[PDB]
From a paper:
Arl1 is an Arf-like (Arl) GTP-binding protein that interacts with the guanine nucleotide exchange factor Gea2 to recruit the golgin Imh1 to the Golgi. Here we report high-resolution cryo-EM structures of the full-length Gea2 and the Arl1–Gea2 complex. Interestingly, Gea2 is predominantly composed of α-helical repeats, with six domains arranged almost linearly from N- to C-terminus, except for the catalytic Sec7 domain that rides above the HUS domain. Gea2 is a highly elongated and crescent-shaped molecule, and two Gea2 molecules dimerize via the DCB and HUS domains to perhaps confer stability and structural rigidity.
To study the Arl1–Gea2 interaction, we expressed in E. coli an N-terminal 17-residue truncated S. cerevisiae Arl1, carrying a Q72L mutation and a C-terminal 6xHis-tag. We found that the N-terminal truncated Q72L Arl1 readily assembled with Gea2 into a stable Arl1–Gea2 complex and demonstrated the in vitro binding of Gea2 with Arl1 by gel filtration chromatography. We determined the cryo-EM structure of the Arl1–Gea2 complex at an overall resolution of 3.3 Å. In our cryo-EM structure of the Arl1–Gea2 complex, Arl1 binds to the peripheral surface of the DCB domain. The binding interface involves the N-terminus second and third α-helices of the DCB just outside the dimer core region. The interaction between Arl1 and Gea2 is predominantly hydrophobic and is mediated by Arl1 Switch 2 and the interswitch β-hairpin. The Arl1 aromatic triad (Phe-52–Trp-67–Tyr-82), along with two adjacent hydrophobic residues Val-54 and Leu-69 form extensive hydrophobic interaction with the Gea2 Pro-71, Phe-72, and Leu-103. Notably, the Arl1 Tyr-78 inserts into the Gea2 hydrophobic cavity formed by Leu-79 and Pro-100. In fact, Arl1 in our structure binds to the opposite side of the DCB domain of BIG1. Interestingly, the Gea2 heel-like motif is highly dynamic in solution; it is invisible in the Gea2 alone structure and becomes visible only in the Arl1–Gea2 complex.
Residue numbers in the entry:
A (entry chain D), B (entry chain C): 18 to 182
C (entry chain B): 76 to 259, 321 to 440, 454 to 471
D (entry chain A): 7 to 30, 70 to 259, 321 to 440, 454 to 785, 792 to 866
The structure:
Amino acid sequence: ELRILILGLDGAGKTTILYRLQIGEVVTTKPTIGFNVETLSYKNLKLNVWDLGGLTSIRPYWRCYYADTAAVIFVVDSTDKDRMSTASKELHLMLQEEELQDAALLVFANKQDQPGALSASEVSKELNLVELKDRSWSIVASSAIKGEGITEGLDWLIDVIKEEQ
Amino acid sequence: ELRILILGLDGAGKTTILYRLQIGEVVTTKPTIGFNVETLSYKNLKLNVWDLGGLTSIRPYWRCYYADTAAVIFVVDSTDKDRMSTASKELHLMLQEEELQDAALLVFANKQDQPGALSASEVSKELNLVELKDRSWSIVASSAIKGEGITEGLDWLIDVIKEEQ
Amino acid sequence: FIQLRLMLNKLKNLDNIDSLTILQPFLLIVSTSSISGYITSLALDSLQKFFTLNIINESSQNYIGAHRATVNALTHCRFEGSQQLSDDSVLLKVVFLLRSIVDSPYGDLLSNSIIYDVLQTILSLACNNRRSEVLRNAAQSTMIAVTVKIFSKLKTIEPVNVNQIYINDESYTNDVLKADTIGTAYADDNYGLPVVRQYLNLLLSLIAPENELKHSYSTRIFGLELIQTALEISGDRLQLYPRLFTLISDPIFKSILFIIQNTTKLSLLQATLQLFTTLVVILGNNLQLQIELTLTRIFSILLDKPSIIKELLIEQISILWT
Amino acid sequence: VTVDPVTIIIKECINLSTAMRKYSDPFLSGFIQLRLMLNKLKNLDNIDSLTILQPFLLIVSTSSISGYITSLALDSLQKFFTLNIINESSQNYIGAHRATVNALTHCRFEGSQQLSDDSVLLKVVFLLRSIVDSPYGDLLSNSIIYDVLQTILSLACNNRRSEVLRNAAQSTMIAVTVKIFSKLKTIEPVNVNQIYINDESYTNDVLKADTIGTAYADDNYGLPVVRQYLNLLLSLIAPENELKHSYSTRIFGLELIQTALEISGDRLQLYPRLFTLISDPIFKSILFIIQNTTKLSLLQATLQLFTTLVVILGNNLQLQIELTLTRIFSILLDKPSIIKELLIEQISILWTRSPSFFTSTFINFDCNLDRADVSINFLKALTKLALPESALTTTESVPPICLEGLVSLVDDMFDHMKDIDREEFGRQKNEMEILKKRDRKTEFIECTNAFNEKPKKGIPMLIEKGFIASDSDKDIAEFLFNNNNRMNKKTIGLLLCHPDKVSLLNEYIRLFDFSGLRVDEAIRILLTKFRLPGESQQIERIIEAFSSAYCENQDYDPSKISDNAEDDISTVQPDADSVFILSYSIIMLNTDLHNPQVKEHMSFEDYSGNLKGCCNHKDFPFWYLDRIYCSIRDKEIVMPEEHHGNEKWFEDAWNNLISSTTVITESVMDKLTPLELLNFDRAIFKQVGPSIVSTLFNIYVVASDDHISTRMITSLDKCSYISAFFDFKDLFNDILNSIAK
Ligand SMILES: Nc1nc2c(ncn2[C@@H]2O[C@H](COP(=O)(O)OP(=O)(O)OP(=O)(O)O)[C@@H](O)[C@H]2O)c(=O)[nH]1
Ligand SMILES: Nc1nc2c(ncn2[C@@H]2O[C@H](COP(=O)(O)OP(=O)(O)OP(=O)(O)O)[C@@H](O)[C@H]2O)c(=O)[nH]1
């Protein structure tokens, strides 16, 4: 009864995050071009999660999927600082899409468990996440291969979903 | 259950002869590549007739088609007598076959309507038909569009067939 | 077969051997009837192997004649059988071999009569309700490929004359689709304009008011799709050829207008409108009275029919002003 | 193509959107977005092709749409490909075409009865065939082409689908195979002068399930996909998965291999992996089918492939051809009659389609000792089968074929005799050394049996009667290195290790080549032609000799690069004891990883562990230990003389006779003068002449047709001419006297 959307640039481990949530395993996934959908039964509520590819040629297709969306997980990539500006621009475009306004934003940044990882406060300030208004805002750094933070982020999301109703 | 084998080089008019026998109407004939079969009956005997074409690539298969054959027709184009020597060689080779010893070499000198038609006696002399090992000699001129010697040749063939038994 | 094997035994290469002699037993056992489906299937397999591994090629005697004879045999493939799956398989092999031959240079070296026969055979397969579905889809795909090849070759020939005046005197009711007898400039030249004119005339014969009741809806939709593919491949070069342009202007546009004005089926109307808007976009500077009349009729329809016709019309006309 | 592609794309978007609306959300929205994006345009100057194709690909791949919408998407993509909308001069066309092939491979829909499913899958197959045939398919990758091959082959080898779809898939497979191996025809030969060690595993590519319906990868496709395709085709026809594939699948695999060989030619020799796959396992499967089958169609396909191999690649498949022909002759001279007819006809295809088959066979085999007589045995079998006595109880069509073979031999011998000037042929006084050593073949067999029973008698016999230059240790080592095809190799193991023979052992081991090879490949090449003994001390001595030789033949440099190196020459320099320890570890790991009786296996952990302290008292780099571990986990060390006896015997025979000789990979008619050719003809005629003359006379006397009599009398005339030319007085007298009688 929930529609969680996982959106992010290519290389943010979106498919790995989805498979870790679904079954809890490290799975090598090729770069997806379309979409993959699975279900989650983390709580008594049953939620359907849609994962979208991150290439440059499919982002408008992301823009098409914004219908009856309950939550959005904007996973970001914690490397290649030259791409942070493009990631922030895409995030601003997604936020100002006038359909995802009534939702909750959650950011993972799963690439912290690697050398040269940016600080969570640093990326949050650089991405102008504080400029957000009238929306839930919470980021939780994590490691996709190991986990730990994934459960925390899902817990926050499900708690805010319960608070919504 | 008689076997009739209509042979002869390209442009001789074998298809026209077969059509005149089968329906008695002049019909445009395409250059045959394979064979045409139209079983007929003149008065009281079935006439299974096999027609073979030229194109200078099917004569080995002319040799292949000799089987339980008692009637042989070797229509030779009277016009363009330069090709007549090739027809003479081919008919000699056909006679030399061991499977057509009991045949009856009958030749129609067709295309008599065209100018410069070669004389039947001269054609037969060029064919040296007198050298046949007591088989037959029935050089009969005829025409394809009009019926001039076709009926006489058919009478000759059916008469020799009847005289066989 | 035995004689061919004897001829070819202990020969290093097919240097002096005529290609038609090599192919003749196979073609004979393909074209003739009274030969079972299994044997003609094997013969078609052998011909396909001899084509996929180029054996009769530019350096062989009578290769033009060899491939012409192969196509002539294929267009008259007749056989006997017991079931229908074998018939479908044999005809699928025939269609595949024809598609392979036509889409090769050796297909470009074929004849006008031969190409017209190929067109008629594949079209009879693709417009026969008594065959299977996979066979018909294969036939339709082959027809679309052959059409593209033919009109692509059209876009290399110079027009016969650019200063003379063409007077429309060739009749349209001359070419009609023939029965499906398969299964259980002049001709004899490398194919050019004459086969294109005959092909366009046949496609007109499929979609025509006078031939309305003699063809199913599927055949007419397929004909409209073929004419549309022909236009899309050819382009604005069809006006340099007077006969093809007359066939597009007078009779085909008459048929389009008749279907737009007097049809209730939605799929046929959709195909007709797609062809009409393609004609407007591509050849519109040379078809002005026709477009005027068609647009006036369409506006008459829209401003006076379960209204789903109206939605179809408005969408397929909206493609214009964007 | 002169039309604007934009209008085509917009029209397809409109029709698909209308169809979806009629049938009924994200997909429709994507199509509307694409329509707007392309409407606000005039040309495709800076719009990527993947964006233009994405909604169609989603419709194709997503398994939640009907077959009607999927068929419409397939039609739209085929229309785009026919009209060449994604040209060479369009952005990201490689990505677009790779994506569209990926979408086709994973096509899924929830549809109506089987007719619509077959139609949709036929559309998929046709689009794949078109894409692969175009150059846009040449720009695809190894992985994409492998997926295409798997999908089409699974469709073509599925018994739960319509015959039309299966036939379409088979045609597509033939076309794709032709394309792939035609590309192989002109790419490059890699490492022409560098030796190859056979380490790849043949059991890593299996056919997947039919889930469609209801260098390295990511690079232009070249050799890797060809190797994977040959591996899959081997898996289809392999002996070890007879139960897992129907007969149609095996026949189709054989036909695909034959088509690949015909398209490629005599260029698989340059590529060592492809030729290894053709030589060892594919020929093993061919022989297994020939020996242990009962269906005629499979046997016919197998024999046709075998004869194609003999015609094309016969100069490098000699041992396999010898073994297969020997098995065929054993079959034909002992199975219903129809099997024998099929064998004799498909083998009759040989002697007509070869320069001079019997002469070439007699030159290669039957003269090179340690190879069984093949040409003489073939001719004797043909003569024995040609008589009507062999016609009885067998097929009636065999004797004419065998007679054709004998007459072909006579005619070829006559052809080698047209202009040779008999006087000058007799002028020769020095016979060829090949024939001189061939006359002493029985003595060689006796000496080899003596060596097998006990070397103490074999060596003096092998030096007294020739066959060895001198009793020097170097000569004995050279003879054991080269001439060991019929010499027992367990005896070599137990002789080359006896303490007194520590000189012959040293020379033998030094006679190998080990430059540039790791310890794994060195051990493979050492045990290739030498069976290790049983006792610990004997293995210790052999390994010590090998270690000394490997270190001496691999002169190192003080560079001693450690880690971060895929090189295997200047990176690891094991002194002498490090080689000893590593070789013992390799030998033990072979048994540990390939002994099914023992549960569990020795993993890499602690295998890297109980080895540190050997290479100058440190640990070997990660690359080397990992490489040897992988190369032992795959392709178990091939050793000679496994075990002879009952139960599994074909595997042992193939192992010993072919796999030992195919571990390391590196005609004669054009190299011989006419006089030498006539000398070989004289030898073979002396051996088999009276039999042929007697057979021809029996056939001629018993015959009744005129053609048979004329042909046989002409053959006897040619035999008389041959007898006159070579001065075979007894045979000439026999022929003419029998004719006169
Ligand atoms: N080492 C490491 N790599 C990770 C981790 N999480 C994701 N990755 C990388 O992510 C890749 C998997 O691809 P995806 O999960 O699909 O990445 P994505 O964000 O979904 O982007 P797309 O591939 O375009 O779908 C792997 O090859 C990893 O290299 C992680 O926690 N540790
Ligand atoms: N007008 C006329 N034409 C004749 C006559 N005799 C022969 N012909 C010509 O002969 C041709 C007959 O064609 P076919 O019998 O099929 O020739 P063929 O022996 O099969 O040789 P191919 O055509 O190469 O296959 C006709 O087209 C005529 O032009 C004749 O008496 N009068």
